[PDB]
Amino acid sequence: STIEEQAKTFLDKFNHEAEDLFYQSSLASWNYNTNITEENVQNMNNAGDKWSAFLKEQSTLAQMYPLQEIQNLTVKLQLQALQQNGSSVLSEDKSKRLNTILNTMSTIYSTGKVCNPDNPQECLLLEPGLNEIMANSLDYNERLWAWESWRSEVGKQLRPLYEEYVVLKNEMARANHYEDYGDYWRGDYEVNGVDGYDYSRGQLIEDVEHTFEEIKPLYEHLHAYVRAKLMNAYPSYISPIGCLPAHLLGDMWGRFWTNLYSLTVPFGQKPNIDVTDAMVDQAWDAQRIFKEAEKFFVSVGLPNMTQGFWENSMLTDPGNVQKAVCHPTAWDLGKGDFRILMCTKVTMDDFLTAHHEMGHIQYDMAYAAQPFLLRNGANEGFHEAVGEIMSLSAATPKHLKSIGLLSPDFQEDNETEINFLLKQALTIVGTLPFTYMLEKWRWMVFKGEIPKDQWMKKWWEMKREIVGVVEPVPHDETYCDPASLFHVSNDYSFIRYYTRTLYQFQFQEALCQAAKHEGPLHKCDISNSTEAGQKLFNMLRLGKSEPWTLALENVVGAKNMNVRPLLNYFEPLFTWLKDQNKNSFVGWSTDWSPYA
Amino acid sequence: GNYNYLYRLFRKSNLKPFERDISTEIYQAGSTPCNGVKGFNCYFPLQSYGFQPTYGVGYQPYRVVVLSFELLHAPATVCGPKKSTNLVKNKCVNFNFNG
Numbered sequence: 001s002t003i004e005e006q007a008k009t010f011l012d013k014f015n016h017e018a019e020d021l022f023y024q025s026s027l028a029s030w031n032y033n034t035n036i037t038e039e040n041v042q043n044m045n046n047a048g049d050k051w052s053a054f055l056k057e058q059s060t061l062a063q064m065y066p067l068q069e070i071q072n073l074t075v076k077l078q079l080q081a082l083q084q085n086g087s088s089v090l091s092e093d094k095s096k097r098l099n100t101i102l103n104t105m106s107t108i109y110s111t112g113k114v115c116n117p118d119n120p121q122e123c124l125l126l127e128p129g130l131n132e133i134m135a136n137s138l139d140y141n142e143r144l145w146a147w148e149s150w151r152s153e154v155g156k157q158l159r160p161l162y163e164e165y166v167v168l169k170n171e172m173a174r175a176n177h178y179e180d181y182g183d184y185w186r187g188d189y190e191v192n193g194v195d196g197y198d199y200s201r202g203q204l205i206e207d208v209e210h211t212f213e214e215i216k217p218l219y220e221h222l223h224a225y226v227r228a229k230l231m232n233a234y235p236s237y238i239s240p241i242g243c244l245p246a247h248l249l250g251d252m253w254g255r256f257w258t259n260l261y262s263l264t265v266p267f268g269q270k271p272n273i274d275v276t277d278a279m280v281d282q283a284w285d286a287q288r289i290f291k292e293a294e295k296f297f298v299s300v301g302l303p304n305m306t307q308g309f310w311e312n313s314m315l316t317d318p319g320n321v322q323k324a325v326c327h328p329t330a331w332d333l334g335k336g337d338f339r340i341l342m343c344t345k346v347t348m349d350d351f352l353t354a355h356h357e358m359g360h361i362q363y364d365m366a367y368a369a370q371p372f373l374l375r376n377g378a379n380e381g382f383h384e385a386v387g388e389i390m391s392l393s394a395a396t397p398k399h400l401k402s403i404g405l406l407s408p409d410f411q412e413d414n415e416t417e418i419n420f421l422l423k424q425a426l427t428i429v430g431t432l433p434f435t436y437m438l439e440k441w442r443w444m445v446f447k448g449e450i451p452k453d454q455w456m457k458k459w460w461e462m463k464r465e466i467v468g469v470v471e472p473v474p475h476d477e478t479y480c481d482p483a484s485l486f487h488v489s490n491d492y493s494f495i496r497y498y499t500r501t502l503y504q505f506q507f508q509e510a511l512c513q514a515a516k517h518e519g520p521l522h523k524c525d526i527s528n529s530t531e532a533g534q535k536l537f538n539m540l541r542l543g544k545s546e547p548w549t550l551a552l553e554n555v556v557g558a559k560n561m562n563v564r565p566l567l568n569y570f571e572p573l574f575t576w577l578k579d580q581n582k583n584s585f586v587g588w589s590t591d592w593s594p595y596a
Numbered sequence: 597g598n599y600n601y602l603y604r605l606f607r608k609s610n611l612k613p614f615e616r617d618i619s620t621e622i623y624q625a626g627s628t629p630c631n632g633v634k635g636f637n638c639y640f641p642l643q644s645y646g647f648q649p650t651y652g653v654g655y656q657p658y659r660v661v662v663l664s665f666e667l668l669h670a671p672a673t674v675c676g677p678k679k680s681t682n683l684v685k686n687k688c689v690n691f692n693f694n695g
């Protein structure tokens with residue numbers, strides 16, 4: 001009869017056939033990931049082509065139902081999600097060119113092999129050949145050689161490709177009634193039609209700048225401390241007044257600073273909280289790790305894992321004969337099928353990763369009652385944030401003492417909390433200016449504020465201004481230095497890590513206030529608290545049915561992303577860094593004083 | 597995937613109790629006539645459940661048998677079995693033989 005009932009029946013048929021087809025595609029991807037064989041690749045490609053053709057046909061059929069004659073918010077949300085053209089609005093030649101460009105960037109990044117000139121008989125790939133060198137070497141010119149040679153090869157291959165990529169993506173985005181591709185990425189946080197809880201695409205950049213202005217003193221003090229410690233490690237290269245050299249940050253790009261914990265430890269004489277040896281002494285299998293994680297999730301009041309989870313997941317490396325991807329991934333295959341693909345070792349990192357991926361599984365299980373096209377996070381930040389809060393809670397010494405992994409006579413003094421908080425800041429705080437600078441640069445590239453001949457002159461200017469990192473030698477416009485990273489070269493949004501980082505500590509403060517924890521925020525554990533799990537599950541059950549602002553009101557009581565929980569989390573470390581930076585100079589100079 | 601089990605997804609009105617609908621006529625959700633072709637706004641009523649062994653317990657196939665017991669004015673003849681206490685002779689007992 002009416003247009004709304006027609007759209008509801010069309011959505012019902014859509015949902016029903018989509019769930020099955022997404023299941024078939026996801027199962028083919030699972031069979032590829034646990035068994036890398038060419039027929040599984042062919043089955044994955046066939047299932048993916050069927051899934052994409054089905055999404056094309058339902059996008060073609062959904063647009064015939066006009067939006068303004070539908071009043072139900074969930075139906076309008078699913079119809080808005082379905083009616084996106086995607087690349088279909090672009091011409092077939094340009095769509096084929098864009099797909100070819102994306103695939104060849106994927107092959108260039110995946111099969112990029114770089115080694116030393118005059119010794120070409122064998123070469124090292126990025127993972128794990130160059131990752132281990134970047135994370136463990138202490139030699140200045142070796143890291144400089146690896147950094148400059150990999151940005152030479154990758155940038156000189158990818159620069160015309162990226163110049164075509166920006167034009168094609170801007171053409172596709174303006175064909176979809178967006179200002180640029182940056183506006184297309186910012187449209188994930190756009191809320192329209194809800195009274196009071198509306199969020200705009202232009203408000204996101206203002207909120208990011210407003211939060212980063214409060215991030216900036218803590219990052220300045222951390223940068224000054226890391227600069228002083230790297231001056232101790234490398235005597236003559238680092239200047240007291242200037243920025244950090246780019247190849248000394250412990251990773252290939254500067255994404256994380258967590259590989260500088262050995263060099264920048266405050267109290268080396270004090271012990272670590274490493275529990276690896278205790279699990280080796282008690283012979284903890286990966287099955288015991290996941291059972292302890294399940295005990296953690298039933299302690300907070302969340303549902304326990306299904307029988308199909310234990311039957312169908314691969315929680316151990318299969319062997320030499322069978323090849324599998326080693327990266328830990330939680331799979332919501334559909335139809336109540338939840339799996340974890342992780343090559344779990346007996347380490348603390350794999351235990352925290354198991355908690356993180358089982359948090360992903362719990363988030364996927366919570367919105368199983370929702371319709372298929374609403375089975376996602378409210379934004380891209382929440383899905384990672386609910387895993388990162390489990391990574392926060394599981395890492396606490398109280399959790400290790402509670403499960404018996406730590407000695408009951410372990411002395412928790414202020415020095416171990418300071419160095420633990422510094423490690424968490426090097427992991428968490430250090431990625432924030434890099435993420436903000438990368439996303440702001442990509443937004444200015446898509447918006448056309450920066451011309452193609454001035455991309456790099458601005459970019460290093462941004463890096464000195466924001467990240468406080470100086471280039472070793474100047475780069476001309478033949479280089480493509482951003483696109484050596486995985487997410488930017490393979491068309492992925494990058495603001496999800498910034499939003500995840502802020503939502504992580506907002507959720508942590510909300511659940512610790514729910515759990516009535518009476519100490520420091522980093523000393524807080526959300527185990528044994530049913531009310532914290534209920535407050536979590538109220539947001540978890542919504543999925544994408546409700547706006548992320550309303551979900552954030554449901555958790556923390558605020559209508560916007562907030563920066564104060566992060567600063568409250570690192571406040572002992574902030575006071576300690578302010579005490580330690582009395583003699584030294586906080587802040588950096590954009591001049592060429594260290595090296596150029 | 598077992599596609600042999602189907603379910604009726606649409607119909608203009610709800611079913612009466614103990615009604616069976618085996619019609620395979622194209623559901624008309626819109627004002628336009630379907631004319632027997634599953635085009636725009638016209639969908640097929642019966643949809644399969646792709647039953648796979650790796651499914652969740654809320655999606656696994658369940659065989660359901662519903663037994664309906666009615667009493668009508670005719671004499672009821674499908675009676676549940678009664679038991680037989682071991683016969684005792686030569687003693688004063690309370691006997692119940694076939695009512």
Ligand SMILES: *[C@@H]1O[C@H](CO)[C@@H](O)[C@H](O)[C@H]1NC(C)=O
Pocket residue numbers: 035037322
């Ligand atoms: C992985 O693929 C190989 C190749 O045929 C096959 O022999 C093996 O059984 C597969 N592994 C599993 C667990 O089925």
Ligand SMILES: *[C@@H]1O[C@H](CO)[C@@H](O)[C@H](O)[C@H]1NC(C)=O
Pocket residue numbers: 072073074075
């Ligand atoms: C919107 O539709 C859903 C089913 O798709 C229904 O449960 C819900 O009550 C509807 N909301 C309104 C306000 O009509």
Ligand SMILES: *[C@@H]1O[C@H](CO)[C@@H](O)[C@H](O)[C@H]1NC(C)=O
Pocket residue numbers: 063083084085088089176177
């Ligand atoms: C998708 O593209 C078609 C033309 O190819 C256009 O008519 C339609 O409005 C587009 N969809 C949206 C949501 O703008």
Ligand SMILES: *[C@@H]1O[C@H](CO)[C@@H](O)[C@H](O)[C@H]1NC(C)=O
Pocket residue numbers: 304305306307
């Ligand atoms: C999950 O918990 C329920 C109730 O405590 C229990 O019956 C079920 O066996 C548990 N699941 C597993 C896989 O142990």
Ligand SMILES: *[C@@H]1O[C@H](CO)[C@@H](O)[C@H](O)[C@H]1NC(C)=O
Pocket residue numbers: 414415418576
């Ligand atoms: C830890 O506490 C003691 C006594 O309260 C103090 O002397 C010491 O400086 C503190 N250390 C740090 C790193 O705050």
Ligand SMILES: *[C@@H]1O[C@H](CO)[C@@H](O)[C@H](O)[C@H]1NC(C)=O
Pocket residue numbers: 299402527528
């Ligand atoms: C939380 O509950 C588990 C299971 O009852 C128990 O073993 C653990 O000791 C509890 N935690 C605390 C801090 O008491």
